[PDB]
Ligand SMILES: N[C@@H](CCC(=O)N[C@@H](CS[C@@H]1c2ccccc2-c2ccccc2[C@H]1O)C(=O)NCC(=O)O)C(=O)O
């Protein structure tokens with residue numbers, strides 16, 4: 001089977017775990033453990049980081065026979081191509097490309113805050129910016145069922161993750177945006193997704209590693 | 218013509234300006250200026266941020282007829298598709314996807330050091346990690362002329378930029394990797410590139426904004 005490697009946290013790998021499930025992919029995971037403070041030992045991963053034949057060793061990685069990939073977006077893309085979940089027109093490609101990158105930005109902004117030792121006093125200032133972030137996603141999606149247009153694409157997997165993440169962070173952040181709540185419901189509604197959510201493999205939290213100030217256990 | 222908007226710095230937009238030239242694109246740029254310390258006014262941009270009709274307003278943006286795009290990677294892919302500068306086989310597509318994402322990682326690493334108040338103290342430790350990063354690009358490229366394979370693709374513009382930036386940061390960083398120095402000279406050798414580098418439009422430095430600790434003027 002295919003081998004997915006990542007930490008034993010949701011981190012940025014949720015869309016991949018979801019995509020593997022949605023596609024009926026035959027895979028096994030290697031969930032690396034991180035030690036507690038103050039050392040935060042990474043040896044389970046460091047012991048093999050340089051022994052897997054990866055070009056640019058990192059987590060996550062996907063081993064698919066002879067093919068070894070790193071970089072989360074590259075992995076999503078690989079699986080999208082294999083299962084025809086890319087945009088089919090130029091307009092769908094452009095929307096998927098923008099979303100792909102936008103999600104990373106919003107992910108980085110959350111990480112910046114969550115790893116700040118000043119988290120508690122920085123928070124109020126971050127909360128302030130949430131409404132604007134959601135509004136842009138809300139207006140982008142508009143009345144479409146999916147982010148690229150009329151059919152699910154890999155970018156829905158990314159968008160779901162980051163919307164879910166913000167909603168965990170600030171549970172009232174989607175109240176003003178019905179289409180976003182609807183989207184989350186629609187996604188969770190997909191048969192293979194609904195099935196996975198009830199499985200032993202499902203890992204919703206923690207989001208971050210033990211070093212974080214929030215969702216770190 | 219097409220319109221490219223960004224700051225009047227190199228920042229992360231070098232690969233797009235080079236691609237616009239390489240492709241003989243009919244473009245104009247709007248280079249916004251930031252004021253000086255202590256407030257470093259961003260008003261030239263902020264006054265029009267929400268009036269351009271962008272889905273997710275940001276810099277850079279590219280207006281191309283009826284298309285309005287943001288997210289530097291999405292601009293790069295849009296132009297790659299436009300001009301047939303994408304990978305043509307599955308192997309080339311994987312290589313380009315890995316490289317695009319890996320360049321952004323190495324880019325972020327540089328930006329984090331350069332905006333750190335403790336730059337001077339951090340520098341030393343940062344220089345020690347260069348060789349390892351350079352070796353991965355060197356081993357990845359190997360004997361190929363270009364990063365994806367036999368043909369120039371948009372990822373070569375990305376890789377050019379990050380290898381060039383690192384080489385500016387540490388002039389000896391490519392000594393032990395002739396294939397990388399070879400690539401820089403090959404890229405620079407493309408006719409439209411060489412012409413552009415002698416022109417009034419070329420902007421090689423500053424890389425960062427006024428706020429940075431390095432290459433800020
Ligand atoms: N751009 C690359 C990302 C390469 C990368 O940095 N990987 C991390 C893990 S990913 C990390 C993380 C670790 C635990 C918990 C959460 C995160 C996370 C969450 C959101 C956004 C970024 C992060 C990140 O801070 C890693 O552990 N690397 C192994 C190593 O260096 O030996 C990608 O998209 O794939």
Ligand SMILES: N[C@@H](CCC(=O)N[C@@H](CS[C@@H]1c2ccccc2-c2ccccc2[C@H]1O)C(=O)NCC(=O)O)C(=O)O
Nearest residue numbers: 105224226228229275276277288289290328424425426
């Ligand atoms: N992922 C997105 C990135 C969207 C984004 O952050 N844009 C910055 C300009 S880019 C910025 C920068 C500003 C000045 C000088 C240098 C940089 C820079 C250089 C290298 C790497 C990252 C950077 C960044 O620190 C900005 O000014 N945005 C307008 C705004 O927020 O209203 C992309 O890839 O396009």
